[PDB]
A paper describes a structure:
The structure of the complex with α-AMP was determined to 1.4 Å resolution. This structure was determined to understand the broad specificity of MjCobT 11. The overall position of the adenine α-ribotide is exceedingly similar to that α-RP so that the primary question is how the enzyme can accommodate nitrogenous bases that differ in both the composition of the aromatic ring and its side chain substitutions. Superposition of the two structures demonstrates that this is accomplished in this instance by conformational changes in the polypeptide chain between Ile 69–Thr 74. This section is ordered with α-AMP and disordered with α-RP. It is conceivable that the disordered section allows for varied substrate specificity which is a hallmark of [name]. An adenine specific interaction arises between the carbonyl oxygen of Gly 177 and the amino group of adenine, but this does not alter the conformation of the active site.
Cobamides (Cbas) are coenzymes used by cells across all domains of life, but de novo synthesis is only found in some bacteria and archaea. Base activation is catalyzed by a phosphoribosyltransferase (PRTase). To gain insights into the mechanism of base activation by the PRTase from [name] (MjCobT), we solved crystal structures of the enzyme in complex with substrate and products.
Author numbering:
A (entry chain B): 1 to 349
B (entry chain A): 1 to 350
The structure:
Amino acid sequence: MSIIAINENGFLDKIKGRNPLFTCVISSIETTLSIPISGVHRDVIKYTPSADVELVFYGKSLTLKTPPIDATGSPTPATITRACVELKNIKNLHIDAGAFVKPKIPFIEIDEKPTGRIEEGKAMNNSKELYMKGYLLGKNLDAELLIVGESVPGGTTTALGVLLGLGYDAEGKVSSGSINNPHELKIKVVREGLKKAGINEKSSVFDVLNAVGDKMMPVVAGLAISFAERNKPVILAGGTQMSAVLAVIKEINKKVLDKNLIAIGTTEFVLNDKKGDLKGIVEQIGNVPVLASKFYFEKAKIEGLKNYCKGSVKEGVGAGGIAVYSIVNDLEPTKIREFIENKFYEWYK
Amino acid sequence: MSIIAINENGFLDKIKGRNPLFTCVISSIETTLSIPISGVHRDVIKYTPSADVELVFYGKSLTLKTPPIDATGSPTPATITRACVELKNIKNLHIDAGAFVKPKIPFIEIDEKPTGRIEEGKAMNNSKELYMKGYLLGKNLDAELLIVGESVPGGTTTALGVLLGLGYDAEGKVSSGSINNPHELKIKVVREGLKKAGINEKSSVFDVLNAVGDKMMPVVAGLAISFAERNKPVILAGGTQMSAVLAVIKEINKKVLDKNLIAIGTTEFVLNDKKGDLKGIVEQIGNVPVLASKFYFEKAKIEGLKNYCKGSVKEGVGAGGIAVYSIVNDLEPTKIREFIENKFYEWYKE
Ligand SMILES: Nc1ncnc2ncn([C@H]3O[C@H](COP(=O)(O)O)[C@@H](O)[C@H]3O)c12
Ligand SMILES: Nc1ncnc2ncn([C@H]3O[C@H](COP(=O)(O)O)[C@@H](O)[C@H]3O)c12
Ligand SMILES: O=C(O)c1cccnc1
Ligand SMILES: O=C(O)c1cccnc1
């Protein structure tokens, strides 16, 4: 039907009828101000993480007059996430780990300062502290299931860097937030940063994150470990970015990862992206469920949604994973498309 | 039962066996740095709201070297709140509505800017927006019971100003965070602010808050209404400050008080404060439960706790209300005193 499952291993039955909390962890990356690594449109990238979570939580962007778009003009995947929050009454609370511009909605502040210059190997100096903060926050969140997404423009580059720094075969395998995927530029950036920071086989996961990660990653790892340690399921709601978070979790607490309570929840558009290879990254990390939602956007009435099928946007803001939860719990998939179609005119003017 | 109850109305049964979320809403008031209205010690007042929630959430204050103290040197009531969250495994997540210096723990940011000059009638310009933010946040907090506290040094003064601005008889009835309760100074501050802002019987509740409230108040009112509207109980965990919040709630949504889902949870020290009159404020607002926890601090080894019985500190950081929840759910009250005594050296090196 409307969920594509790889290595499902009973995970879907652990989430049917369970009470979720959705949280999106946001960050900005200083590199994106000067180097065109991101597929988010340059005119909105500084405002995109906060505008995304404003749309999800409040129903419209406040930091921008219309919600964000990718380079090809397709709408933010926060449109999908908002549709699911409304259609399934999903409680949502969002976390800042360094957006350039902060949300105008209530939000959880973990670190005001953006992710740094990846090409200098100076992403952050505090990845262990951010992990600890995500874990301690997670212990105070009460839900039966955590659905944790991201909005980090540039985050497919940091995902590549972290996977490479940990020793995985990831060149050419990470996705992009738009149709074009400038792999040569991304490799140049992360290889430079890994070299400058002296990353090698002996480096710890926190050294790798400090060099070329983004600040969302340790926070999400902490939240996820806090839930799985308590025997609660977690959907890492994202694409190849969440494969990097999964690799980080394996380095921090493999025993918790081995409980089989953590899955990747993404979209059909990422799973079927021929310019990357999500399934192939995950195979290197472990036997972890990969679940992808189908949207039937080929027959959407919004051209920008039809363009997801060509590679525009694909994923983000937890869209794929929140849709997996929603569809497993009985939401008819075309209700997502119809919701967006209904709200699109007022959102985009 | 170690609980003093006024107009209980069966509320104690609504909180027994329910899973709580504890949240402390923090703010700072610009007036407190210029005029000595607060009972929090002037050396630490700027840092107190954030140090309080750091103690509760993490177990250590992180900018201050030790936790806060009142003007007499007695320990912050966050000691009680920390004891309860540990002893009863209470989940907690704290909210900033304008502390001067922010927490170093994760926290929910609602408004970074402090509450302004009460004596100028310029507390804030955005009470309506702050109410809506607390309301929408509350819809996204999943708990069976909300325990909502505050840490707002100077908050007994803004409580007096809001109560007077709404037309209550409140002079001499608000409490104080230390032994001295400077009623004549407080009344001058708030009546000057009310006059400057032009507040009268035609003003809205948001006009009153914009003149002389603190930013915690509309946030808490929104949180509380969001829960009670959903048929869930709320403990307003504070003293005379929460009576002002209750009056705000009545102005915004009086019918929600008819559900009997909102109670004030405070300490014996506030209820029995002979320099204030909590019961006499609440009687003017409505038939709302007022529940007060007993601590048996007369028998403590630490002078700082014994001083609560003489009027030091009294309440704050949700201590009274979280203790009401804990005692109703079978916590032996003296385990609080004992926990504090056991950690006092780690916290204060005394
Ligand atoms: N693609 C997107 N388009 C419009 N709005 C978006 N908000 C998030 N994303 C998504 O794309 C970004 C990652 O892709 P890259 O590495 O190319 O920047 C993240 O922000 C992700 O959430 C968006
Ligand atoms: N009294 C206190 N002493 C030490 N630390 C405190 N933290 C909060 N309070 C408490 O006292 C303050 C209100 O009293 P006033 O209007 O006199 O300032 C609030 O901060 C309240 O939480 C404290
Ligand atoms: O692979 C990802 O994580 C991804 C792809 C497209 C857009 N946002 C994220
Ligand atoms: O009356 C109050 O609200 C109060 C009294 C003392 C300390 N904190 C609050």
